Amino acid sequence: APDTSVSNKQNFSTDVIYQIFTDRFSDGNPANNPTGAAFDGSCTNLRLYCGGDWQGIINKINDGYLTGMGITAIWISQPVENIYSVINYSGVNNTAYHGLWARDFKKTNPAYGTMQDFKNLIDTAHAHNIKVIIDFAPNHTSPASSDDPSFAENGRLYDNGNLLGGYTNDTQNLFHHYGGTDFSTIENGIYKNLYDLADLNHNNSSVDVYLKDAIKMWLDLGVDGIRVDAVKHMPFGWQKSFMATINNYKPVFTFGEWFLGVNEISPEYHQFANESGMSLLDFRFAQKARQVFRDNTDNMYGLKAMLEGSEVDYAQVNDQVTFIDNHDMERFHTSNGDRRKLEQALAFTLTSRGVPAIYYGSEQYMSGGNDPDNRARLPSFSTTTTAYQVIQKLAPLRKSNPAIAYGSTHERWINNDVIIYERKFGNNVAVVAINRNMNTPASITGLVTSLPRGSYNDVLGGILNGNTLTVGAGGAASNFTLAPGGTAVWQYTTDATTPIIGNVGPMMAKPGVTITIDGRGFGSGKGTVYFGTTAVTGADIVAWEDTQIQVKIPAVPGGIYDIRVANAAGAASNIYDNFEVLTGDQVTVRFVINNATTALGQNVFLTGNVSELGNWDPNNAIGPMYNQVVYQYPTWYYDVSVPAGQTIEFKFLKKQGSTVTWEGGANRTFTTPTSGTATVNVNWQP
Ligand SMILES: C[C@H]1O[C@H](O[C@H]2[C@H](O)[C@@H](O)[C@@H](O[C@H]3[C@H](O)[C@@H](O)[C@H](O)O[C@@H]3CO)O[C@@H]2CO)[C@H](O)[C@@H](O)[C@@H]1N[C@H]1C=C(CO)[C@@H](O)[C@H](O)[C@H]1O
Ligand SMILES: [Ca+2]
Ligand SMILES: [Ca+2]
Numbered sequence: 001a002p003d004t005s006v007s008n009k010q011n012f013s014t015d016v017i018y019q020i021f022t023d024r025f026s027d028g029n030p031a032n033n034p035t036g037a038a039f040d041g042s043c044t045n046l047r048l049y050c051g052g053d054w055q056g057i058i059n060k061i062n063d064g065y066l067t068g069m070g071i072t073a074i075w076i077s078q079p080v081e082n083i084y085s086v087i088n089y090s091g092v093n094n095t096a097y098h099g100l101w102a103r104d105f106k107k108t109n110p111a112y113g114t115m116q117d118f119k120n121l122i123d124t125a126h127a128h129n130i131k132v133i134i135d136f137a138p139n140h141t142s143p144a145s146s147d148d149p150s151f152a153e154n155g156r157l158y159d160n161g162n163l164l165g166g167y168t169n170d171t172q173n174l175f176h177h178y179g180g181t182d183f184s185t186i187e188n189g190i191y192k193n194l195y196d197l198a199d200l201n202h203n204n205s206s207v208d209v210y211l212k213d214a215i216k217m218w219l220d221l222g223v224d225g226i227r228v229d230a231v232k233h234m235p236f237g238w239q240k241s242f243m244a245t246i247n248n249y250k251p252v253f254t255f256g257e258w259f260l261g262v263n264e265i266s267p268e269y270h271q272f273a274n275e276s277g278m279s280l281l282d283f284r285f286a287q288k289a290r291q292v293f294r295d296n297t298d299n300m301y302g303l304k305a306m307l308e309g310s311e312v313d314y315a316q317v318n319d320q321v322t323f324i325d326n327h328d329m330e331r332f333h334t335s336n337g338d339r340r341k342l343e344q345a346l347a348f349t350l351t352s353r354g355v356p357a358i359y360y361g362s363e364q365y366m367s368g369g370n371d372p373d374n375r376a377r378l379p380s381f382s383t384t385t386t387a388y389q390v391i392q393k394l395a396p397l398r399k400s401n402p403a404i405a406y407g408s409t410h411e412r413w414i415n416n417d418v419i420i421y422e423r424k425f426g427n428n429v430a431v432v433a434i435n436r437n438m439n440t441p442a443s444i445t446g447l448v449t450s451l452p453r454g455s456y457n458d459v460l461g462g463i464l465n466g467n468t469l470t471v472g473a474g475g476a477a478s479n480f481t482l483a484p485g486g487t488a489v490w491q492y493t494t495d496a497t498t499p500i501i502g503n504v505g506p507m508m509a510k511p512g513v514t515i516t517i518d519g520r521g522f523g524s525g526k527g528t529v530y531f532g533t534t535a536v537t538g539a540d541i542v543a544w545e546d547t548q549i550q551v552k553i554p555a556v557p558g559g560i561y562d563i564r565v566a567n568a569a570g571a572a573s574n575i576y577d578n579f580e581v582l583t584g585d586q587v588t589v590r591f592v593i594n595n596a597t598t599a600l601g602q603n604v605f606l607t608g609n610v611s612e613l614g615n616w617d618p619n620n621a622i623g624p625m626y627n628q629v630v631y632q633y634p635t636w637y638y639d640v641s642v643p644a645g646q647t648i649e650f651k652f653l654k655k656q657g658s659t660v661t662w663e664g665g666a667n668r669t670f671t672t673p674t675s676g677t678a679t680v681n682v683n684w685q686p
Contacts, residue, residue, distance in 0.1 A: 003502070003518040003547040004399040006072075006129040009224040009252040010505030010516040013318045014405040015072040015131060016350070016395040017357040019326060022077040022112050023049055023097040024377045025360060026056030034111050038086045038095050046372035047094045054113035058124045065381055066130065069363065069388060070395025073131040075227060079118060079218070081107040083142040083153040098375075099135060100229060101142035101197075103153065105214035106160040122222035133225030133253070134218060138211045138242070139234045144198035146170070146177065155198025159210060167198045176201050178629055181233075186268065189233050191629045202238045203590050203639065205676030212245050219250045231256035231272065231280070237588055237622075237639035243277030244586040244641065247506040248513055253355075254278045255321050259328060262287050262297075270313050274578070277508045279319040282354055284310060286323050293324075293345040293436060294332060300419045300436070304411050307352070307421070311409060315578045318406060318503050322354035324362070327375060331359075331368040339365055340485045343390055343464060344434055347487050350394040351423065351432045353409055363387040386463055393460055394489065401493050402520050403428035406502025412449055418442045418482060424450050426500050426520060430491040431469070435482040442482040449475045456490035464488070496521030496546075499565045499573040508580035509553055514542050517549040517576075523567035530564040531556060531581070558583035558611035558643075583610045583643035588677050589670075592637045593625070593652050595684040601656050604636040608650030612642050618653060618660045645674045652684070 001007050004014050024043065033039055033051045040048035057074065060066050066074070078099030087094045099109060108115055125132050144155025144167035155167035157174065165174050176199040181192035193199045202208050215226070226246070231239060246254060256276075258269055260283035273280045288306040291298040310317055324345045325332040333342045342365065349356050361378045363385055368374045382388075397404050403425040413420035417437040423430040429450045435442045451471045458466035466488030470478045482488075499521040506515060517529070526544045529536045529551045536554050543550040549565065563576040596604045605623030607614045614620030625636035642648060650668050654661040665685040672678060 001543070001548060002545065005548075006126055006131060008516065008518070008548070009131070011319075011503050011518055012073060012131070012225065012253045012355045013503055014399045015355060016070055016391070016398060017073045017075050017133070017321065017355060018066060018069075018071040018360060019075045019357055020057065020077070020360045021052070021327070021375055022054065022057070022099070023052040024375055025052045026060055026378075027051035027053060028055030028057070028059045029053050029113070032111055032113065034095070036086070037093055038084070043377040045093070046375055047092060047097070049095055049097045049111055050377055052377075053111065054117045054121045058121055060381070061124050061128050061130060065383060067128055068383055068392070070392050071130065071358075072395070072399065073133060073225070074125065075133040075225070075357065076135070077112065078102065078135040078137060079108050079112060080105050082109050085143075085152045087143055087152055096142070100137050102137060102140070103142065103156065104158040104160065105211065106217060118221060126222070131224040132222070133227055134223050135227050135229060136215060136218075137229035138200065138202075139230040140194065140197040140199050142198060143196045144175075145196070164206065164210070172206065173201055173204055174207055175199055185628075186232070187626045187629055190235055194230065194233055202235065202588065203677050203679065208238070208588065208677050209675065212242065215242070215246060216249055219246070219252065223252065225253040225255075228254060228256040228278065231276070231278070232258045235588075235639040236272065236276065237641045239276055239278070240641040241586040241588045244508065244510070244582055247277065247509045248585060251506040251509065251513075253319075253505065255280060255319075257281050257328070258283070260284060260287065262291070273320065274315040277506070277580070279316065279321065281326075281357075282310075282320040282322045285320070285349075285352070285354065286325070286329075289324055289345055289348060290332065293341050293348065294337075299416050300414055301416075303419060304414055307409050307411070316503070316507060317353055319505070320354045321357050322349050322352060323357040323359065324349055325374070326357070326359045327371065329374070330370055331366055331374050332362070333365050333367050335367055338438070339386065340438065343387055344436065344485065344487050346387060346390055347394060347432070347460070347464065347489065348434060350391065351397070351404055351430060351489055353407070353423070356398075358391060363391055389463055390460065397430070397459065397489075397491070401428055401430055401491055402426070402502060403430045403491070406519065413444055413447050415442065420444070420447060422449055425502060426496045426498065427494045428492065428520075430489065433466075433482055433486070433488045435484060435486045438485045441484055442486075443479065444482060445479050447477045449477060451475055451490065451492050456492070459489040459491060460487060499523070499527070499567050499571055501563065501565060501573050501576045504563055504576050504579065507578065508582060510582045510584050511553045511555045513553050514550050515553060517551070517563065517565060518547065519565075519573070520547060521567070521571075521573070522546050522549055522565060523569070525568045527568045528566040530566065531579070532561040553581055556581055559615070583612060583646070585644040585674075586612070586641045587644045587673055587675060588639055589642050589672060590637060590639050590677070590679040591625075592631055592635060592679065592681045593684060594635045594682065596636050596652065596654065597634055597684070598654055599656060602654050603656075604652055605655055606638065606640065606650060606652050608642075608648050610643055610646070610648050613640070613648060613650055618655065621653060621655070623655070642672055644672055647671045
């Protein structure tokens with residue numbers, strides 16, 4: 001099927017995501033509304049249920065409100081059954097309107113709708129070619145106090161009705177009991193409790209297995225994507241095994257949230273996006289866009305930089321979800337500011353690279369500070385606001401113009417307040433000009449583009465004050481003045497004669513799994529896919545078409561491969577690097593080493609003979625290991641994702657600068673379990 005098909009759950013670059021807070025969208029059914037001091041039908045107290053439900057979105061999909069806007073994917077609240085407690089955090093009552101206080105990952109939250117209400121939703125969405133992404137928060141359950149088992153629901157957890165246990169009297173060790181985090185370190189913020197949320201222990205097989213069976217159930221119901229909450233507060237090694245489980249079953253576009261601030265850029269943030277098996281929410285985009293288009297704390301050369309720095313730092317930049325604001329930051333639109341800033345910021349996000357995400361209510365100029373302020377109810381549904389129009393005219397370009405979805409970015413003209421950039425994928429082009437200045441016009445002299453001779457009409461139709469572009473000979477355009485706050489989008493689309501890859505999903509799976517390659521130029525008849533030097537053809541290619549090829553991963557040794565395509569006429573595509581074929585199914589193993597004495601600047605790492613363990617290369621060793629919470633120095637520990645049911649070999653090492661110190665003795669061997677978890681306890685051998 002084509003790359004734009006609703007059946008394409010692996011990739012979302014050609015989609016526009018509408019982020020909804022079920023509760024604060026539309027109450028399509030009152031019979032299911034919570035009652036008592038948990039309900040606030042006037043959405044006056046923003047920490048209470050307002051009544052929104054799934055039937056409320058089915059209504060907005062049916063009467064054409066969402067569809068008429070151009071949206072092709074809704075991202076909703078956690079569908080999982082929550083605690084029913086009305087928590088009075090010092091004077092203020094609080095409820096689980098946000099879906100983030102899980103109670104039973106196998107049942108739906110009654111207030112949002114029933115199991116039948118969920119199928120209806122998946123079916124009304126798909127029948128209108130809209131994809132559904134859900135939230136999943138496997139890092140915890142709900143507010144719990146072990147000292148006072150009378151608080152909330154005591155962080156209890158049920159398995160489809162059966163109680164597994166609570167935060168008080170945890171003999172089975174389902175949770176962590178190390179106090180709460182002060183966010184001092186990454187280690188600290190992972191094993192310690194986030195504020196007061198009963199932190200789950202994934203080293204416990206019962207927990208590990210339960211969360212994995214839970215996500216599959218949700219995959220079986222029809223979801224097309226997953227947004228995992230708090231990726232920074234769970235162990236990396238477990239997440240990889242959680243991903244390998246999704247991808248090895250029914251892969252869906254999965255992404256997670258890792259909050260970055262202003263001009264804050266961490267390498268762990270990138271390492272996660274590059275090696276977890278899942279992408280992140282592009283906070284590097286969001287904060288930079290708001291600095292230039294909103295707070296005006298940086299100029300266009302910072303925008304240029306960011307767009308360029310990203311095209312390299314991320315391994316698969318086309319998979320990062322972009323946005324201008326959301327549930328974790330103040331609303332982009334202010335009181336003392338004009339709607340133009342918002343109108344432009346939206347256009348910039350819509351034509352830029354990644355998976356664009358619009359936080360509900362942005363098209364109705366909703367204003368509001370931090371939580372719960374940024375989570376008020378959508379005041380209206382007027383399909384005639386300019387912002388509605390902008391999204392309306394731009395959104396479908398992602399599915400029609402391959403350059404918007406997969407193309408590279410090139411700044412063709414730049415200034416302190418104006419930028420003109422090009423997105424191109426083969427012959428397809430899209431030029432976007434923006435003058436953020438509202439006072440002075442911008443005379444553009446000598447603008448060269450990839451557009452062929454012609455005079456292109458603004459796709460925005462002038463509502464953003466955009467002109468038409470007369471492109472003469474050599475892609476050069478006649479001079480023009482870009483009006484203050486002007487914005488224009490010009491484009492060109494044509495067939496692809498050369499195979500070209502725009503994206504691949506999933507980015508890691510075991511042999512025998514079907515991956516999805518998307519692009520243009522693949523051709524009608526079956527061709528050839530290269531995983532490294534290993535060529536795949538015949539029955540192993542499940543599907544071939546001009547825009548999308550589906551092929552099984554061949555039996556190769558685990559490791560990183562470069563993907564490449566060749567049509568039936570030997571025309572080979574560009575290289576799509578960084579594909580991880582795993583050794584097989586994964587399980588998480590905690591490795592604990594005792595007596596590793598280290599110097600100031602020396603850390604302990606691990607390595608072994610399978611690719612998930614770096615394949616003996618000390619530059620790809622797992623680490624630096626942990627040494628303060630679950631175990632303290634001189635004992636180090638780490639949760640690592642390894643192949644299931646195999647005898648792996650490994651040795652620990654110390655690393656300091658360019659100096660590496662290996663353990664003495666013989667290689668350690670270990671037979672991994674087929675499911676669940678395992679813990680290896682050892683002592684440093686000199
Ligand atoms: C509140 C939020 O905090 C934890 O994770 C991140 C946030 O996602 C991140 O945005 C940042 O928090 C705020 C930031 O400090 C502030 O300067 C900025 O203006 O806005 C941010 C959002 O408020 O930093 C923290 C990490 O230090 C949790 O991991 C998130 O899950 C949490 N949001 C969840 C959690 C709870 C639990 O109480 C819900 O109450 C909340 O509604 C839900 O969204
Ligand atoms: Ca309701
Ligand atoms: Ca945790």
